[PDB]
């Protein structure tokens, strides 16, 4: 008659909204006598002591689903890794809520992890669509971050399988280096001029300074980046007219937490239809036996489709990701980010704004200077 | 024999005149270099990683160092799987040279 | 330095022989300080994996950690990789679930395993398929993760080999259940050799479908990776007697013989790092960021003559794989052993195991003997640049004796050509039979030598 | 072209002991009878003959 | 007439040996002879066999 739900959450003031959403979870779901029990833990500057505080609390508390979200960490790693590792030791679904690192897509590494925010690799899912819109058939892919950029390049090559075309030239290098103009000078001789970049901020400022000192930001040099390259000091050093993306309800954390609580609530009320309700035992004290219906409960969590909440139409794919997200296309109109189009699940819908390109006129630059 | 000896040189003959005819008809300039060995190009495994390689003119082509090979290029099935050809301009076979 | 070897196993092997594994070992001491601490444990919870690790790091700043296991839990290697990333301590995995392969490491992680990647095992399986000229095959993979990288590695391996791999398109499955369109995709298989990538729970359903769709025939082969064939005890009855898998869990190379090499790897790396940097002890103070590490240093190592080098991704250069089969006694035979870099096999005479289940009777395999003659049966070595009998030649075997003091010899696989070879190929086209060809080692054509032909 | 054809591989196993790098050195080798035959493209041979 | 083997069908429900006999077929034209109650199951199996 009780269901334990763990919370590994950033601030104390969002814990009140978390408990309110827990209270509203049993509100309209009938007179059934199930209970929802809450436990909230916060930031620690040391990473081992995070999992040390999480394990003997939540495993002995016998939680079924753990909601983990920590944006305001001054450490640039942004890793909720040890909580997910500890709960995946006994196959307990950690639902990531704010981090977007593409290392969590591999379920061979994170054995029982799910997430409700899309990672950066699915930004490539927009970019090929951009190639469908403005007649772009020859792109130049540049990847700085070798950690997740291999997966992004793999996703772009998967999206280029049906067209059976490739990029003109793909380039990768060390995250953190400075002398990066030798890549761009060999990228200067390329006939196409549509340039797509995937990087982090410490490399984004370097490649922006390199493109500024080589004067490779003028006419024809069409840029296309993601969310990492438009934040920090990279937005300050950004070349004018750059086209990036913005997450709708990506940084509004509390509404996404409430939507995740509604997701977990409908998943629990769907799982209570089935019998064989096993419990993950007190594995911290001696119990090496893992929970038996881990993949069963996870496969219940996979195909869950929704229509209510701030997210609303939230659905999980074969990788357990945010199906059909909404990205606002942002343009750098005189160092000011202006929304110049939206994107729902299947197609780019322009608004009535002016798309100021990084070169000259508002007409699209067909940047194919055939030699 | 020669580790590094590259001087400006005078190239002429048949295919050079063909290239001059193409640059006369189609509006483009050019910059002729030569290949860094004496091989046309074959399909040879490198030492490790279980990977094939093309050397020679296809080697400098597929590395991006060239864009158009104007040479006595023998048309076969193996090269046409990886690069596109045009229609031929001179037809030959194979024979023996004796004394 | 201080090095701890902790072993978590229910199969109770004692700890004092590890102390015996230190006295005569490292007799020529190149470091100025070698110290070992052996510990045993019967619990494998992460609470111990935090607490005892912090105790050993507070225990005189232990720089070397060696962990072994006997269970099937791969999340232990996921925990220890994070612990090695946080504590700056090189940690080695030995066996059990701790040696199970994880995909992507961290640059701040110094964790290493004794095991082979899915790409190296795919290379071994394709070498097996090349050595038997099994060029026509298919690929049946489920949605168990790592499958996209596996299919991509196969498709990159096909386009870079002198074999000419006939690749039927990759049949993938939606769920583990017997769906309609998945059954339609499985019925499209008309080839023989199938690379089956799945998990141990999925294999029972897939091979039950295979028996339900006739895919367990006497000509149909089945080659699977290591993760689906785990414990040697738990082998379900839904496996065909004739399944070939590859796994490095050798019964000869025990745990002590592997940790005897791992401690030598650690001491060799520390002693060679002492030749370049002075302050080898660099540890973390307490649980509650140096530069000179052994992560970027032990690219090659040669302990006891054996090559035990590592890769940039964090694997073994020379992993000791074993090619096992599933014989008619429902057991796993140590059939193939891995060579220097190449692969050797014991059964060059490939056994039938013609009935996978109890009742599969057929009569279409033929044993054919012949003899070397100059216009008819020209027998030559295989082409060493390609390792392939080219398509006018056919595979054959010859029992070439190594020495004549004993009767030992090797069934060397060679290439036949000439006139009768084309006759046998056209007969196999017309009559449509499966034939096995081998040279005779008794002698010439024939003579009744004292009522013995 | 002689590697693909399965009935011309034997000459291949001869020519792997004798193949050269440039045409003119082979012309000079067969010119002073250091070689004895030379299989080549017909246009170059009909020019140099 | 280039003729393939005489594929017979004992039962369409056994789904093991008769399916292998159908897998032997790769020719274009097939003459079929059975009853009306069996042809639905035979062509339903041959549809999923391509
Ligand atoms: C996204 O918004 C559009 C706005 O109309 C929806 O409509 C579809 O738009 C696509 C654009 O390629 C058309 O191909 C479809 O025919 C449109 N459908 C209809 C019936 O109008 C679209 O449904 C919205 N949602 C999705 C699926 O992303
Ligand atoms: C359930 O909720 C309370 C709220 O403070 C929490 O402290 C505790 O973990 C749980 N207590 C029970 C009744 O188990
Ligand atoms: C990068 O390297 C080139 C090498 O010539 C040098 O000219 C250039 O100044 C370097 N740029 C930076 C930013 O280091
Ligand atoms: C700026 O652009 C002009 C365009 O001609 C170029 O000449 C110049 O070299 C660029 N500046 C630098 C320092 O690269
Ligand atoms: C986040 O969404 C909730 C629900 O609509 C709303 O109450 C809150 O103001 C939003 N926060 C912002 C300003 O992003
Ligand atoms: C629970 O699991 C057992 C396993 O044998 C199964 O027999 C039983 O039907 C299951 N009960 C239900 C209805 O979930
Ligand atoms: C994305 O937009 C569509 C259309 O308004 C909506 O149905 C869906 O719920 C939105 N998803 C998010 C991010 O809330
Ligand atoms: C060109 O050829 C020879 C041999 O490779 C080399 O030593 C030298 O640099 C050059 N000599 C001539 C003949 O120009
Ligand atoms: C040919 O090329 C030149 C230089 O790019 C260009 O200015 C001119 O318009 C072209 N003229 C012809 C004859 O096509
Ligand atoms: C392998 O590398 C060595 C050293 O460069 C070279 O001598 C040898 O020819 C290479 N083998 C090939 C061509 O794979
Ligand atoms: C290992 O098992 C023994 C015997 O049951 C027990 O005394 C001990 O508590 C277990 N391990 C430890 C050190 O806790
Ligand atoms: C091992 O690596 C070193 C470089 O650190 C190399 O010089 C040496 O040749 C290698 N070992 C041997 C003996 O081959
Ligand atoms: C085979 O082992 C030898 C040492 O006996 C060494 O050359 C190399 O590691 C291996 N590779 C070769 C040459 O096959
Ligand atoms: C066979 O016997 C001969 C006797 O001289 C010996 O030289 C040879 O090594 C033996 N082994 C083989 C090749 O069978
Ligand atoms: C056995 O055979 C091998 C290879 O022919 C040879 O090297 C060796 O000397 C032989 N030994 C004897 C004593 O026959």
Bridge partners of residue A198, in order along the sequence: A143
Alpha carbon C246 to chain centroid, angstroms: 4
| Alpha-carbon span A313 to A325, nearest angstrom | 9
Tell whether A85 is within 8 A of chain C (Cβ): yes
Read off the DSSP letter of residue C67: E
Atom of ligand 8 nearest to the CA of B1: 5
| Alpha-carbon span A348 to A343, nearest angstrom | 5
Q: Is A224 helix (H, G, I), strand (E, B) or coil?
A: strand
Contact A227, A200 (CB under 8 A): no
| Alpha-carbon span C98 to C92, nearest angstrom | 9
| Alpha-carbon span A255 to A249, nearest angstrom | 8
Beta strands in C127-168 (DSSP E): 136-141, 166-167
| Alpha-carbon span C335 to A247, nearest angstrom | 56
Alpha carbon C78 to chain centroid, angstroms: 22
C340 C-alpha vs ligand 13 centroid, how far in Å?
Answer: 6
Contact C118, C144 (CB under 8 A): no
State the angle between helix axes of A149-159 and A124-133 in degrees (0 to 180), rounded to the nearest 10: 40
Read off the DSSP letter of residue A46: S
Question: Token pair of C52, please?
Answer: 């005892």
Alpha-carbon distance C170 to nearest alpha carbon in chain B (angstroms): 22
At residue C308, what are phi and psi to the nearest 5 degrees?
Answer: -130, 40
Question: Token pair of B56, please?
Answer: 């020679």
**Substitution candidate for ligand 6 out of A272, A276, A277 with most atoms within 8 A of CB:** A276
C42 C-alpha vs ligand 11 centroid, how far in Å?
Answer: 7
Residue in this structure with the two tokens 């190449």, named with its chain if needed:
C342
Question: Token pair of A74, please?
Answer: 């001054």
C-alpha dist (Å) from residue D34 to C251, D45, D49? 61, 18, 18
Q: Is A132 helix (H, G, I), strand (E, B) or coil?
A: helix
Query: Each residue of B32-59: b (16+ CB within 10 Å) or e?
Result: eeebeeeebbeeeeeeeeeeeebbbbbb
Chain D CB contacts of B94 under 8 Å are: 39-42
Contact C223, C244 (CB under 8 A): yes
Task: Please give all residues whose beta carbon lies within 6 A of any atom in ligand 13, as ranges.
Answer: C 307, 340-341
Contact C214 E50 (CB under 8 A): no
Breaks (C-N over 2.5 A) in chain D follow: none
C-alpha dist (Å) from residue A17 to A20, A23, A39, A252, A257? 5, 10, 13, 13, 9
Q: Is A104 helix (H, G, I), strand (E, B) or coil?
A: helix
Burial of A271 (0-12, 13-18, 19+ CB in 10 A): middle
Contact C76, C16 (CB under 8 A): no
| Alpha-carbon span C410 to C397, nearest angstrom | 9
Q: H-helix or E-strand containing D43?
A: helix D42-48
- Distinct helix (H) and strand (E) counts, chain A: 9, 13
Q: Is the dihedral of CA A268, A250, A148, C92 positive or negative?
A: negative
Alpha-carbon distance A196 to nearest alpha carbon in chain C (angstroms): 24
Task: Residue D10: count other Cβ atoms within 10 Å of its Cβ.
Answer: 11
Tell whether A370 is within 8 A of chain B (Cβ): no
Nearest CA to ligand 15 atom 5: C402
Question: Token pair of A38, please?
Answer: 């809450």
Tell whether B31 is within 8 A of chain A (Cβ): no
Contact C218, C240 (CB under 8 A): no
Question: Token pair of D15, please?
Answer: 């020519």
C-alpha dist (Å) from residue B29 to A343, B21, B22, B64, B70? 43, 12, 10, 18, 14
Tell whether C31 is within 8 A of chain E (Cβ): no
Q: H-helix or E-strand containing A9?
A: strand A2-9
Strands C332-337 and C322-326: antiparallel
Tell whether A215 is within 8 A of chain C (Cβ): no
Q: Is the dihedral of CA E40, E45, E48, E50 positive or negative?
A: negative
Contact A201, A231 (CB under 8 A): yes
- Is B3 among the annotated ligand-binding positions? no
Burial of C171 (0-12, 13-18, 19+ CB in 10 A): middle
| Alpha-carbon span A86 to C110, nearest angstrom | 20
- Which are the contacts of B65, defined by CB distance < 8 A and separation ≥ 6? none
Nearest partner of C79 among D23, B16, A90, judged by Cα: A90
Strands C136-141 and C166-167: parallel
State the angle between helix axes of A81-88 and C75-87 in degrees (0 to 180), rounded to the nearest 10: 150
DSSP notation for A255-300: HHHHHHHHHHHHHHHHHTTSS-------TTTT--PPPTTHHHHHHH
**Substitution candidate for ligand 14 out of C399, C400, C401, C403 with most atoms within 8 A of CB:** C403
Burial of A275 (0-12, 13-18, 19+ CB in 10 A): exposed
DSSP notation for A55-87: HHHHHHHTEEEEEEE----SSTT---HHHHHHH
**What is the CA angle A71-A74-A80, rounded to 5?**
45
User: C with B: 3 or more CB pairs under 8 Å?
Assistant: yes
Ligand nearest to the CA of C300: 12
In the A/B pair of chains, how many CB contacts fall below 8 A? 3
Read off the DSSP letter of residue A239: P
Nearest partner of A356 among A234, A223, A262, A255, judged by Cα: A223
**Substitution candidate for ligand 5 out of A252, A260, A310, A311 with most atoms within 8 A of CB:** A252
- Which are the contacts of A241, defined by CB distance < 8 A and separation ≥ 6? A223, A331, A332, A333, A356, A357, A358, A359
Subunits next to A (3 or more Cβ pairs <8 Å) are B, C
| Alpha-carbon span C184 to C270, nearest angstrom | 58
At residue C282, what are phi and psi to the nearest 5 degrees?
Answer: -140, 95
C-alpha dist (Å) from residue C192 to A81, C6, C195, C233? 44, 46, 10, 28
User: A with D: 3 or more CB pairs under 8 Å?
Assistant: no
Ligand nearest to the CA of C40: 11
At residue A126, what are phi and psi to the nearest 5 degrees?
Answer: -85, -35
User: Is the C-beta atom of A17 inside 6 A of ligand 5?
Assistant: no
Chain A CB contacts of C103 under 8 Å are: 106, 108-109
Nearest partner of C215 among C243, C192, C248, C242, judged by Cα: C192
Length of chain A: 371
| Alpha-carbon span A271 to A265, nearest angstrom | 10
Read off the DSSP letter of residue C3: E
- Distinct helix (H) and strand (E) counts, chain C: 9, 20
Residue in this structure with the two tokens 């014991």, named with its chain if needed:
C346
| Alpha-carbon span A368 to A77, nearest angstrom | 38
| Alpha-carbon span A10 to A69, nearest angstrom | 6
Residue in this structure with the two tokens 């004394």, named with its chain if needed:
B99
Task: Residue C393: count other Cβ atoms within 10 Å of its Cβ.
Answer: 21
Tell whether A166 is within 8 A of chain B (Cβ): no
| Alpha-carbon span B83 to C411, nearest angstrom | 43
Q: Is C145 helix (H, G, I), strand (E, B) or coil?
A: coil
- Which are the contacts of A205, defined by CB distance < 8 A and separation ≥ 6? A232, A233, A234, A237
Strands A94-96 and B94-96: unpaired
Q: Is A40 helix (H, G, I), strand (E, B) or coil?
A: strand
- Which are the contacts of A226, defined by CB distance < 8 A and separation ≥ 6? A120, A123, A198, A244, A245
Query: Each residue of A178-215: b (16+ CB within 10 Å) or e?
Result: eebbebbeebeebebbbbbbbbbbebbbbbbebbeeee
N- to C-terminal Cα distance for chain C? 71
At residue A96, what are phi and psi to the nearest 5 degrees?
Answer: -70, 145
Contact A310, A256 (CB under 8 A): yes
Task: Residue C216: count other Cβ atoms within 10 Å of its Cβ.
Answer: 23
User: C with D: 3 or more CB pairs under 8 Å?
Assistant: yes
Burial of C381 (0-12, 13-18, 19+ CB in 10 A): exposed
Chain E CB contacts of C214 under 8 Å are: 15-17, 19-20, 23
Task: Please give all residues whose beta carbon lies within 6 A of any atom in ligand 3, as ranges.
Answer: A 178-179, 181-182
Residue in this structure with the two tokens 């590490």, named with its chain if needed:
C293
Residue in this structure with the two tokens 């190149």, named with its chain if needed:
C30
Task: Residue A128: count other Cβ atoms within 10 Å of its Cβ.
Answer: 17
**What is the CA angle A30-A33-A39, rounded to 5?**
105
| Alpha-carbon span B35 to B54, nearest angstrom | 13
| Alpha-carbon span C150 to C146, nearest angstrom | 6
C-alpha dist (Å) from residue B32 to A345, B8, B20, C31, C301? 50, 11, 11, 60, 48
Ligand nearest to the CA of B49: 10
Q: Residue B95: which of D4, D27, D45 has the nearest Cβ?
A: D45
| Alpha-carbon span A75 to A145, nearest angstrom | 17
Secondary-structure percent of chain C, ordered helix, strand, coil, rounded to 5: 25, 25, 55
| Alpha-carbon span A225 to A237, nearest angstrom | 14
Alpha-carbon distance C128 to nearest alpha carbon in chain E (angstroms): 27
Beta strands in A155-256 (DSSP E): 169-172, 194-198, 243-247
Alpha carbon E37 to chain centroid, angstroms: 14
Question: Token pair of B96, please?
Answer: 């023996």
Contact B11, B32 (CB under 8 A): yes
| Alpha-carbon span C374 to C382, nearest angstrom | 18
A311 C-alpha vs ligand 5 centroid, how far in Å?
Answer: 12
C-alpha dist (Å) from residue D7 to A291, C198, C417, C418, D12? 64, 43, 10, 11, 10
Contact B97 D38 (CB under 8 A): yes
Alpha carbon B72 to chain centroid, angstroms: 8
C-alpha dist (Å) from residue A62 to A90, A359, C330, C338, D28? 11, 58, 41, 46, 88
Query: Each residue of A293-320: b (16+ CB within 10 Å) or e?
Result: bbbebbebbbeeebeebebeebbbeebb
Nearest CA to ligand 14 atom 9: C403
Nearest partner of B52 among E36, C349, C157, judged by Cα: C157
Binding residues of D: 41
Q: H-helix or E-strand containing C411?
A: strand C409-417
Alpha carbon A112 to chain centroid, angstroms: 17
User: Is the C-beta atom of A345 inside 6 A of ligand 1?
Assistant: yes
Nearest CA to ligand 15 atom 4: C402
A312 C-alpha vs ligand 5 centroid, how far in Å?
Answer: 14
| Alpha-carbon span E22 to E45, nearest angstrom | 9
Q: Residue C44: which of A85, A108, A288 has the nearest Cβ?
A: A288
At residue D24, what are phi and psi to the nearest 5 degrees?
Answer: -70, -35
Tell whether C213 is within 8 A of chain E (Cβ): yes
Task: Residue C315: count other Cβ atoms within 10 Å of its Cβ.
Answer: 19
Read off the DSSP letter of residue A50: H
N- to C-terminal Cα distance for chain B? 30
Residue E15 backbone zone (phi > 0: left; psi -120 to 50: alpha; other: beta): left
Question: Token pair of A107, please?
Answer: 């379920």
Tell whether A288 is within 8 A of chain B (Cβ): no
| Alpha-carbon span A320 to A114, nearest angstrom | 6
Question: Token pair of A304, please?
Answer: 């869950």
Please state the three-class secondary structure of C357-406 as a single string: CCCCCCCCEEEEEECCECCCEEEECCECCCCECCCCCEEEEEEEECCCCC
Ligand nearest to the CA of A348: 1
Contact B67 A371 (CB under 8 A): yes
Which structural technique was applied? Answer: cryo-EM
Q: H-helix or E-strand containing C38?
A: strand C35-41
Task: Please give all residues whose beta carbon lies within 6 A of any atom in ligand 14, as ranges.
Answer: C 401, 403-404
Question: Token pair of C411, please?
Answer: 């069934």
Subunits next to D (3 or more Cβ pairs <8 Å) are B, C
Residue in this structure with the two tokens 């369109």, named with its chain if needed:
C181
Strands B43-45 and B52-54: antiparallel
Question: Token pair of D7, please?
Answer: 């009935």
């Amino acid at each position: 008659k009780i269901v334990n739900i763990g919370a590994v959450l950033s601030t104390r003031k969002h814990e009140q909204m978390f408990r309110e959403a827990v209270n509203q979870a049993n509100k309209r779901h009938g007179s059934w006598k199930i209970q929802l029990n809450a436990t909230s833990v916060t930031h620690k500057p040391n990473a081992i002591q995070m999992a040390l505080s999480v394990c003997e609390d939540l495993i002995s508390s016998q939680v079924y689903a753990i909601l983990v979200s920590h944006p305001p960490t001054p450490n640039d790693h942004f890793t909720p890794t040890p909580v997910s590792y500890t709960a995946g030791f006994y196959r307990i679904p950690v639902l990531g809520l704010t981090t977007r690192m593409s290392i969590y897509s591999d379920k061979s590494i994170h054995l029982s992890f799910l997430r409700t925010v899309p990672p950066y690799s699915h930004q490539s899912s927009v970019w090929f669509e951009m190639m469908r819109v403005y007649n772009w058939n020859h792109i130049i892919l540049l990847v700085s971050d070798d950690h997740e950029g291999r997966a992004a390049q793999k996703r772009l090559e998967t999206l280029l399988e049906e067209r059976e075309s490739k990029a003109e030239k793909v380039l990768q290098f060390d995250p953190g280096t400075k002398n990066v103009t030798a890549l761009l000078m060999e990228a200067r001789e390329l006939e196409a001029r549509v340039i797509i970049l995937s990087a982090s901020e410490d490399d984004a400022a370097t490649v922006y300074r390199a493109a500024a000192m080589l004067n490779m930001t003028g006419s024809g040099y069409v840029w296309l980046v993601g969310e990492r390259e438009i934040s920090g000091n990279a937005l300050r050093y950004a070349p004018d007219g750059i086209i990036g993306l913005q997450l709708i309800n990506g940084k509004n954390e509390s509404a996404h937490i409430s939507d995740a609580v509604g997701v977990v609530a409908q998943a629990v009320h769907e799982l209570l239809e089935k019998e064989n309700i096993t419990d993950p035992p007190r594995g911290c004290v001696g119990n090496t036996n893992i929970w038996k219906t881990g993949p069963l409960f996870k496969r219940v969590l996979m195909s869950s489709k929704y229509a209510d909440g701030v997210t609303g139409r939230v659905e999980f794919n074969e990788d357990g990701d945010r199906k059909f997200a909404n990205y606002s296309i942002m343009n750098l109109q005189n160092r000011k980010l202006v929304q110049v189009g939206i994107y729902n699940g299947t197609h780019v819908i322009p608004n009535d704004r002016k798309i100021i390109w990084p070169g000259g006129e508002t007409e699209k630059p067909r940047g194919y200077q055939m030699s | 024999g020669s580790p590094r000896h590259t001087v400006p040189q005078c190239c002429y003959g048949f295919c050079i005149d063909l290239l001059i005819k193409l640059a006369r008809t189609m509006n483009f300039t050019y910059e002729v270099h030569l290949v860094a060995d004496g091989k046309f190009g074959t399909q040879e495994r490198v030492n490790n990683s279980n990977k094939k390689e093309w050397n020679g003119m296809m080697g400098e082509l597929l590395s991006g160092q060239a864009d158009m090979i104007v040479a006595p290029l023998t048309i076969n099935n193996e090269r046409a799987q990886y690069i596109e050809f045009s229609k031929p301009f001179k037809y030959q076979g194979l024979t023996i040279l004796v004394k | 330095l201080n090095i701890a070897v902790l072993l978590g196993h229910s199969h109770d092997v004692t700890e004092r022989e590890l102390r015996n594994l230190w006295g005569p070992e490292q007799a020529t001491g190149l470091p100025l300080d070698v110290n070992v601490v052996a510990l045993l444990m019967n619990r494998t919870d992460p609470k111990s994996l935090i607490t005892h690790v912090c105790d050993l790091m507070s225990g005189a700043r232990i720089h070397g950690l060696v962990f072994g296991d006997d269970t099937d839990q791969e999340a232990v290697a996921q925990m220890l990789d994070f612990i090695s990333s946080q504590t700056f301590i090189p940690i080695l995995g030995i066996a059990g679930g701790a040696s199970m392969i994880m995909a992507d490491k961290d640059p701040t992680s110094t964790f290493f395993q004794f095991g082979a990647s899915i790409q190296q095992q795919a290379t071994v399986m394709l070498k097996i398929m090349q050595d038997y000229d099994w060029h026509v095959f298919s690929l049946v993979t489920t949605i168990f993760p790592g499958y996209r990288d596996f299919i991509s590695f196969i498709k990159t391996t096909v386009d870079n080999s002198f074999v000419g791999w006939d690749m039927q398109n990759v049949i993938t499955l939606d769920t583990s259940f017997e769906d309609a369109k998945t059954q339609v995709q499985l019925k499209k298989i008309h080839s023989s050799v199938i690379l089956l990538y799945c998990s141990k729970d999925e294999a029972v359903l897939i091979l039950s479908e295979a028996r339900s769709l006739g895919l367990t025939g006497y000509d149909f082969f089945w080659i699977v990776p290591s993760l689906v064939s785990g414990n040697t005890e738990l082998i379900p009855k839904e496996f065909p007697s004739g399944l070939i898998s590859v796994s490095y869990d050798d019964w000869d190379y025990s745990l002590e013989a592997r940790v005897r090499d791992g401690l030598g790897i650690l001491t060799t790396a520390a002693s060679s790092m002492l030749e370049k940097f002075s302050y080898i002890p660099e540890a973390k103070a307490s649980c509650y960021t140096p530069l000179h590490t052994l992560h970027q240093f032990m690219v090659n190592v040669t302990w006891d003559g054996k090559d035990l080098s590592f890769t940039e991704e964090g694997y073994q250069v020379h992993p000791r794989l074993v090619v096992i089969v599933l014989n008619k006694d429902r057991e796993w035979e140590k059939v193939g052993k891995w060579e220097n870099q190449t692969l050797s096999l014991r059964h060059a005479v490939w056994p039938r195991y013609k009935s996978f289940s109890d009742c599969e009777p057929d009569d279409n395999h033929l044993s054919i003997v012949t003899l070397e003659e100059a216009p008819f049966v020209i027998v030559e070595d295989i082409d060493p640049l390609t390792e392939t009998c080219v398509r006018n030649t056919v595979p054959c075997r010859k029992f070439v004796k190594i020495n004549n003091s004993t009767n030992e010899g090797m069934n060397v696989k060679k290439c036949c050509k000439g006139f009768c070879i084309d006759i046998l190929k056209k007969l196999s086209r017309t009559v449509k039979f499966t034939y096995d060809l081998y040279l005779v080692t008794n002698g010439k054509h024939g003579k009744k030598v004292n009522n013995v032909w | 072209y002689f590697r693909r054809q399965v009935e011309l591989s034997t000459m291949y196993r001869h020519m792997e002991k004798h193949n050269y790098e440039s045409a003119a050195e082979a012309i000079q080798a067969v010119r002073d009878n250091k070689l004895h035959a030379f299989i080549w493209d017909s246009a170059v041979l009909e020019f140099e003959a």
